[PDB]
């Protein structure tokens, strides 16, 4: 029944997936804010070069550096890392093969863009490898630099392949240092230090993809965290009144009586119109509940976030973080 079991508080790596447009970026930032509260330091990571963090915080494009982007409750801190795949490839060539010179020459002729584009496995090795480096990084006192890492991850249709370290490494050169580092990446991803959260909307396709992703991830023995149901709406009607209204039955006599009590007398065209407005609302709720029922089969914790009435601004991220905190996210 809880949306956040205690085990999830021990997790250092949070991966936020879900279908496009369900709220991965918004919720990964709200999750980062929640985990940073109480003088903690959390890293918010994006991996597709889309600059979604900068767009969310309404700031210019972020460079390839970990930078403070938000102050969490009671002295907490959220740092941002927009991974630059081109700069990550040069970092890799220089650190693992001492080809920093070759790398710098490739950048001047657009060859790094090419190599990362023509080899999707190399791309995923660079990205998951950098994610692992942020997770295991220690300070001067052998203590973790970050309390948690939150990844605004690829969508539900790409998440299983993105975390498939064995398939990504298969198209890379045999031997060297990469094949040794990949073992540590696999170990981290499959441990109790990781959790994959799946953002969904109460719509057919986001729910279907959530189910299909959980199945693919369970087969890979990858740890599932929570299902996060975004943009919930108020029912406004009691279960019995809703079930009837979804069929076209709203007793008007009771409605007309309750309107007279509040000092409201409506004409026949406005009263009939008011009734079909509630039938249509109840038809929308019923259909959403029918879609939501498909998730009941999963023995996975579920979290719920409301709809922010206007556009998602900085203040909206704090309201969603507060909504997560009230549900036990810590």
């Amino acid at each position: 029944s809880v949306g956040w079991p205690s085990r999830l508080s021990g997790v250092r790596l949070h991966l936020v997936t879900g279908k496009g447009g369900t709220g991965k970026s918004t919720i990964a930032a709200a999750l980062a804010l929640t985990l940073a509260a109480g003088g903690r330091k959390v890293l918010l990571v994006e991996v597709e070069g889309r600059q979604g963090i900068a767009q969310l915080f309404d700031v210019p494009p972020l460079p390839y550096q970990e930078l403070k982007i938000a102050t969490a409750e009671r002295g907490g801190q959220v740092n941002a890392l927009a991974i630059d795949i081109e700069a990550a490839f040069l970092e890799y060539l220089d650190m693992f093969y001492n080809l920093g010179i070759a790398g710098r020459a490739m950048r001047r002729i657009g060859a790094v863009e090419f190599a990362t584009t023509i080899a999707p496995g190399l791309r995923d090795v660079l990205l998951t490898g950098k994610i692992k480096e942020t997770v295991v990084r220690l300070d001067k006192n052998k203590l973790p630099v970050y309390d948690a890492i939150v990844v605004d991850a690829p969508p539900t249709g790409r998440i299983a392949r993105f975390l498939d370290v064995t398939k990504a490494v298969s198209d890379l050169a045999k031997g060297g240092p990469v094949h040794a580092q990949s073992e540590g990446v696999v170990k981290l991803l499959h441990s109790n230090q990781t959790a994959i959260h799946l953002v969904t909307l109460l719509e057919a396709l986001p729910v279907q993809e959530t189910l299909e992703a959980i199945e693919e991830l369970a087969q890979m023995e990858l740890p599932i965290g929570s299902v996060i149901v975004n943009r919930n709406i108020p029912a406004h009607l009691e279960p019995q009144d809703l079930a009837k209204a979804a069929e076209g039955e709203v007793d008007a006599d009771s409605v007309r009586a309750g309107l007279l009590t509040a000092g409201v007398k409506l004409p026949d065209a406005d009263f009939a119109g008011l009734l079909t407005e509630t039938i249509q609302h109840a038809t929308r709720i019923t259909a959403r509940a029918e879609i939501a029922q498909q998730l009941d089969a999963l023995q996975v914790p579920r979290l719920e976030l409301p709809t922010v009435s206007d556009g998602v601004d900085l203040g909206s991220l704090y309201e969603l973080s507060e909504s997560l905190a009230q549900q036990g996210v810590r």
Binding site: G20, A102, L172, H236, V255, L259, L274, D310
Partner: protein, 355 residues
């Protein structure tokens, strides 16, 4: 404002191609299908090129199969025209393109190439490029007086117009032959790729360059884009009553204007028109008096007030688009109280679109 007359555009046979554009998740596929079904009801011989219909809609159109070719949608005998439909198969369209230019013999090698199968066919912009290629294939066969074009989903509505050319220029890069199929800079880059990438992958990539043997891809994307400039082409921009979708619609409208491309108008989909004239302030207060004192009446007032607030947001969003684009014809489509996944729901949607 100004009212978009989709019915008159559909009935006029000088309109040969109707392109349904916008961001993803706004109603492009269903609008495309509803428009095509309508044209057929008007007596036209129409083909709908769908991208991603939901399973139940695809089944209702009889296009749930693996085909990449139009099929006849059986309709009531009274229907004077003909509806034909298909769902784009992105990978199969790439195969058709490869064979058209390489020939069926050389195509056997390219189709069997592991780099082609796993990398080349899934590059960014393939969905838009293959939609354009299929549109080109439909036009060349002259099997229909009207072609309704659905466009792939994206957060960026302009990807339909820009992604094929972008993919084309990437495919024509000097880097393919030079780095896979010597120099100081190219030699350094070649060494780096040999050191990092798998020998098997590099062999399949170089084999693909040798096998394909193409500025071929950009020239193809350019000629196919010129088909959208032919007389009888109409663009329909679709948007949900959301700020992101409207901003994408506005970006698309600007581009059509800059390029002198004919824009039919905007489909402002999923609206919540008020069926009760009672003001919002009065509705909340009437519900609040009942709260202090039968839970049915107050909840009914809370539905109406919430819809009214939703209707207010929709009106101010539209007035922002209309203020910036006063020349753009518009049609408001209400959110229907059922899923648009059968021929009867498409008919009800077409009624909203053509009123």
């Amino acid at each position: 404002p100004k009212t978009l007359d989709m019915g008159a555009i559909l009935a006029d046979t000088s309109n040969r191609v109707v392109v349904c554009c916008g961001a993803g998740g706004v109603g492009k596929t269903t609008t495309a299908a509803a428009l095509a079904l309508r044209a057929a009801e008007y007596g036209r011989t129409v083909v709908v090129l769908t991208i991603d219909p939901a399973k139940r809609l695809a089944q209702a159109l009889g296009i749930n199969d693996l085909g990449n070719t139009p099929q006849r949608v059986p309709l009531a005998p009274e229907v004077p025209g003909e509806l034909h439909a298909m769902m784009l198969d992105m990978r199969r369209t790439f195969d058709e393109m490869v064979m058209q230019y390489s020939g069926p013999e050389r195509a056997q090698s390219i189709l069997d190439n592991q780099f082609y199968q796993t990398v080349a066919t899934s590059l960014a912009g393939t969905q838009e490029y293959m939609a354009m290629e299929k549109l080109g294939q439909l036009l060349s066969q002259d099997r229909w007086d009207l072609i309704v074009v659905d466009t792939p989903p994206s957060r960026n509505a302009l990807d339909f117009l820009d992604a094929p050319k972008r993919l084309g220029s990437f495919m024509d890069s000097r880097l393919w032959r030079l780095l896979l199929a010597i120099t100081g800079v190219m030699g350094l880059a070649m060494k780096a790729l040999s050191t990092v990438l798998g020998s098997q992958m590099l062999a399949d990539a170089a084999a693909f360059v040798q096998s394909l043997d193409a500025g071929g891809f950009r020239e193809k994307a350019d000629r196919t884009y010129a088909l959208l400039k032919r007389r009888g082409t109409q663009f329909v921009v679709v948007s949900a009553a959301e700020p992101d979708a409207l901003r994408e619609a506005s970006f698309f409208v600007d581009r059509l204007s800059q390029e002198s491309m004919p824009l039919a108008g905007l489909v402002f989909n999923r609206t919540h028109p008020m069926l009760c004239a009672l003001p919002i302030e009065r509705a909340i207060d009437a519900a609040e008096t009942l709260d202090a004192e039968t839970s049915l009446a107050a909840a009914v007032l809370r539905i109406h007030a919430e819809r009214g607030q939703t209707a207010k947001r929709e009106i101010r969003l539209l007035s922002r688009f209309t203020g910036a684009n006063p020349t753009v014809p518009v049609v408001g489509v209400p959110s229907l109280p059922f899923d648009v996944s059968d021929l009867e729901a498409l008919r009800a949607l077409a009624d909203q679109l053509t009123t």
